[PDB]
Design a protein around this ligand. Structure first.
Ligand SMILES: *C(=O)[C@@H](NC(=O)Cc1ccccc1)[C@@H]1N[C@@H](C(=O)O)C(C)(C)S1
Length: 264
């Protein structure tokens, strides 16, 4: 893998673009796997994770499957204490009904199901257990403090953390080949493609996971371009509740970076 090589020009334009937006606080990290071209604009800063933390939790899930601690077909119970509002379909089912572990893990990601997330976190031994695993993978600022939906934003991550975990997964670390490919398939079938994917050119693919708690919006993943290049991408923006400028800034930066990598 080539050395990290900042595109100093393009970084400056992106910083100029974020810093002229008053009530927005942005952090982002991008890395090109072929050139080593990198972009870091507040990429190491800590943010409320919102639902972006569901990506690290999915990694933890498949790690457990790899290690024989969890099975894809075992039945998980939707206990009252795990039922959660906001995004998800499980919450409308009978309390104490049960679901295949894999089905639950998929819902956590595809539709950001918060009940499903709580079920997985609990099954994997709880937040502390997961936090330790995140630390082991090098995720310095990725921490579960509260169950989902965690609308207050107590759960933390960083753009570098999200992008770096994805780099690792993309390069075949952490997870087995079978679990990796399952994870990427799930992460290509999310229903929210309004952020990073909205700035990509025709024929690009992206495995990613968005997060939105109104006061914070973000997205992270891995992009394959039609030209053959691959890069990882993560951006988080603090905003006034549901400010459409926050989501638009992510598009804009996504577009800027995609086009720069087309030209080079
Ligand atoms: C993760 O942050 C999730 N958000 C919620 O559960 C609360 C919420 C609040 C206001 C609007 C929508 C949701 C789910 N994941 C985000 C995301 O993936 O960006 C959704 C908008 C899909 S809800």
């Amino acid at each position: 893998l080539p050395p990290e090589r900042p595109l100093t020009n393009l970084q400056q334009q992106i910083q100029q673009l974020v810093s002229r937006q008053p009530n927005l606080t942005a952090g982002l990290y991008f890395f090109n796997l072929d050139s080593g071209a990198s972009l870091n604009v507040g990429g190491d800063q800590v943010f409320p994770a919102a639902s972006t933390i569901k990506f690290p939790i999915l990694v933890a899930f498949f790690k457990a499957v790899d290690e024989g601690r969890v099975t894809l077909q075992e039945r998980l119970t939707m206990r009252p204490d795990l039922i959660a509002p906001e995004a998800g379909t499980l919450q409308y089912q009978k309390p104490n009904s049960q679901y295949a572990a894999l089905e639950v893990a998929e819902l956590m990601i595809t539709i950001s199901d918060n009940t499903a997330t709580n079920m997985i976190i609990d099954r994997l031994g709880g937040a502390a257990e997961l936090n330790q695993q995140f630390q082991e993978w090098g995720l310095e600022n990725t921490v579960i403090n509260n169950p989902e939906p965690d609308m207050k934003g107590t759960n933390t991550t960083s753009p570098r953390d999200l992008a770096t975990l994805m780099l690792k997964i993309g390069q075949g670390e952490i997870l087995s080949p079978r679990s990796r490919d399952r994870l990427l398939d799930i992460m290509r079938r999310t229903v929210t493609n309004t952020l990073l994917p909205a700035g990509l050119g025709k024929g690009a693919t992206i495995a990613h996971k968005t997060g939105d708690i109104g006061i914070v919006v973000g997205d992270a993943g891995m992009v394959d371009m039609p030209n053959g290049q691959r890069y990882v991408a993560a951006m988080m923006v603090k905003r006034p509740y549901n400010d459409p400028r926050g989501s638009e800034l992510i598009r804009q930066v996504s577009r800027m970076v995609y086009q720069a990598f087309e030209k080079l």
